[PDB]
């Protein structure tokens, strides 16, 4: 049994957890923010830009967490800490 094999299996499962959590969070948060935007636009025809601004803030906030998780997955599964 190569120790690197156990390390890499653990790292792959960890990266899978990272991406699963990131995708769940991103999808749900983006859906909720988009629901807010859609309801606001439906109520007001001309609220487009003034709702796009806070909607962009929210989307950026959520995608920041998503992409931080993605980067740490890349770290996990391409330069595995503790490997030897």
């Amino acid at each position: 049994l190569d120790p690197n094999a156990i390390i890499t299996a653990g790292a792959l499962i960890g990266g899978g957890l990272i991406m699963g959590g990131g995708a769940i969070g991103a999808g749900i948060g983006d859906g909720i923010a988009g629901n807010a935007l859609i309801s606001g636009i439906a109520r007001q025809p001309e609220a487009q830009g003034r709702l796009f601004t806070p909607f962009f803030i929210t989307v950026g906030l959520v995608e920041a967490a998503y992409f931080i998780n993605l980067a740490f997955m890349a770290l996990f599964v391409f330069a595995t800490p503790g490997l030897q």
């Binding site: 109520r43 007001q44 025809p45 001309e46």
Partner: protein, 46 residues
């Protein structure tokens, strides 16, 4: 009050519910019409 319909003319945001406001306002409209009738009757009497 028979309903008078026309084709067409930001939608209004009613609270708590449009039906509740309608039910609470229809008697108010009836009272307003009665008051207008009374005022017109007073003017005609004078």
């Amino acid at each position: 009050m028979e309903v008078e319909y026309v084709g067409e003319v930001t939608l209004y945001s009613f609270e708590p519910d449009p039906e509740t406001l309608f039910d609470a306002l229809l008697p108010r409209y009836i009272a307003t019409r009665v008051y207008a009738a009374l005022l017109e009757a007073a003017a005609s009497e004078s």
